[PDB]
């Protein structure tokens, strides 16, 4: 499938707990970079925001190549932070959380053609005031779309062909606005699917550091290595989920 060969955008954001949470999120950048350098992937420092003791509030990035997306699609969800952190004077085990979104490429096929047939323009004199010329000759060149039903009006000035150019620029601007609004609502819906409420609820992956083990909810593994994941070499967490996802 060509959807598996696409690049990805990783969005690692902080959930509960601030910095303790931020540090956990920051490590994950190190996790997937050590995971990524074992294969030869490009990490894009597209977006980041710092935390008080290290670790990040919201980080957004591009990873390009040949086949980044499936792993990202699998990951989207929550991550537990169980640790004895550095920002503590009591020395207890505390929980925080982070959220990781995996977005596909969706390459921009923008600017469809204007299309003359589909939209009908009506030549009317126009409204306004002050000239002998104002009444006699038309200056309302309304552009009406056929497939969407939008009319652009630049009963604007002096003559009707500069008003045609103005009304076509308004058609192009309103097409671009109405398509990018749907895409930001289509990204937003996808973003919501990728990241829940951000709380300490279990979403498909945990991290248990004073125990030395990692539970996964779907296709869970009893690997207490955490260490392998920490400097790349996870394969063992991602592969059996793919194995019993290809069965469905």
Partner 1 sequence: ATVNQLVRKPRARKVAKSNVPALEACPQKRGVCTRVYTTTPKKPNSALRKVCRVRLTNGFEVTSYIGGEGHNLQEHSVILIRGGRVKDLPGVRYHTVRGALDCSGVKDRKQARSKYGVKRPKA
Q: Which residues contact RNA by CB under 7 A?
A: 16-21, 82, 85, 87-89, 92-96, 200-202, 206, 208, 211, 215, 217, 220
- Judged by beta carbon, residue 196 or residue 232, the one nearer partner 1 is 196
Taking the least distance from each CB to RNA, the nearer of 40 and 92 is: 92
- Taking CB within 5 to 8 Å according to partner kind, which of partner 1, RNA, none is near residue 156? none
Residues 6+ apart with CB under 8 A from 88: 20, 94
The entry of RNA, partner 1, none that residue 197 binds, CB within 5 to 8 Å by partner kind = partner 1
Min CB(197)–RNA separation in Å: 11
Report which of 31, 23, 34 is spatially closest to residue 84, judged by C-alpha positions: 23
Q: Which listed option, RNA, partner 1, none, makes contact with residue 220 (CB within 5 to 8 Å by class)?
A: RNA
Q: Measured between alpha carbons, how far is residue 83 from residues 79, 96, 105, 162, 200 in Å?
A: 13, 9, 35, 67, 14
Say how far apart CA 31 and CA 95 lie, in whole Å.
19
By beta-carbon proximity to partner 1, the closer residue of 166 and 200 is 200
Select from RNA, partner 1, none the partner in contact with residue 215, using the beta carbon and a kind-dependent cut-off of 5 to 8 Å: RNA
Closest alpha carbon to 230 in 214, 211, 216: 214
Q: How far is the CB of 207 from RNA (least distance, A)?
A: 10
Total residues interacting with partner 1, rule: CB under 8 A: 4
Shortest distance in whole angstroms from residue 48 CB to RNA:
18
| Spatial CB neighbours of 115, under 8 Å, sequence gap ≥ 6 | none
246 vs 120: CA distance, rounded Å? 51
Smallest gap from residue 51 Cβ to RNA (A): 9
- Are 180 and 78 in contact by the 8 Å Cβ rule? The answer is no
Count of alpha carbons within 13 Å of 208, Cβ hemisphere only? 12
Q: What are phi and psi of 157, to 5 degrees?
A: -155, 170
Output the DSSP codes for 28-55.
Answer: HHHHHHHHHTTTT-EE---B--B-BTB-
Closer to partner 1 by CB, 189 or 201: give it: 201
Comparing CB distances to RNA, the nearer of 21 and 72 is 21
Residue list 166-205, contact with partner 1 (CB under 8 A):
197, 199-201
Q: How far is the CB of 199 from partner 1 (least distance, A)?
A: 6
- Applying CB under 8 A, the residues found at the interface with partner 1 are 197, 199-201
């Amino acid at each position: 499938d060509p959807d598996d060969e696409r690049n990805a955008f990783l969005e690692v954001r902080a959930g509960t707990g601030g910095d303790e949470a931020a540090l956990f999120a920051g490590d994950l950048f190190r996790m997937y970079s050590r995971y990524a350098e074992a294969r030869r992937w490009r990490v894009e420092i597209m977006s980041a925001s710092e935390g008080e003791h290290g670790g990040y509030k919201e980080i957004i990035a591009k990873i390009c190549g040949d086949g980044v997306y499936g792993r990202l699609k699998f990951e989207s969800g929550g991550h537990r932070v169980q640790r004895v952190p550095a920002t503590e004077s009591q020395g207890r085990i505390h929980t925080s959380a982070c959220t990781v979104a995996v977005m596909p490429e969706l390459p921009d096929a923008e600017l469809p053609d204007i299309n003359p047939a589909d939209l009908r323009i009506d030549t009317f004199r126009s409204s306004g005031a002050g000239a002998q010329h104002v009444n006699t000759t038309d200056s309302a060149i309304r552009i009406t779309h056929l497939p969407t039903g939008i009319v652009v009006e630049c009963q604007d000035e002096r003559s009707q062909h500069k008003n045609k150019a103005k009304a076509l620029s308004v058609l192009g601007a309103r097409i671009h606005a109405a398509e990018m609004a749907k895409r930001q609502q289509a990204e937003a819906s996808t973003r919501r699917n990728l990241l829940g409420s951000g709380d300490r609820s279990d979403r498909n992956r945990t991290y248990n550091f004073p125990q030395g083990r990692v539970t996964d909810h779907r296709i869970n593994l009893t690997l207490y290595r955490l260490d392998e994941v920490m400097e790349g070499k996870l394969d063992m967490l991602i592969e059996p989920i793919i194995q019993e996802h290809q069965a469905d």
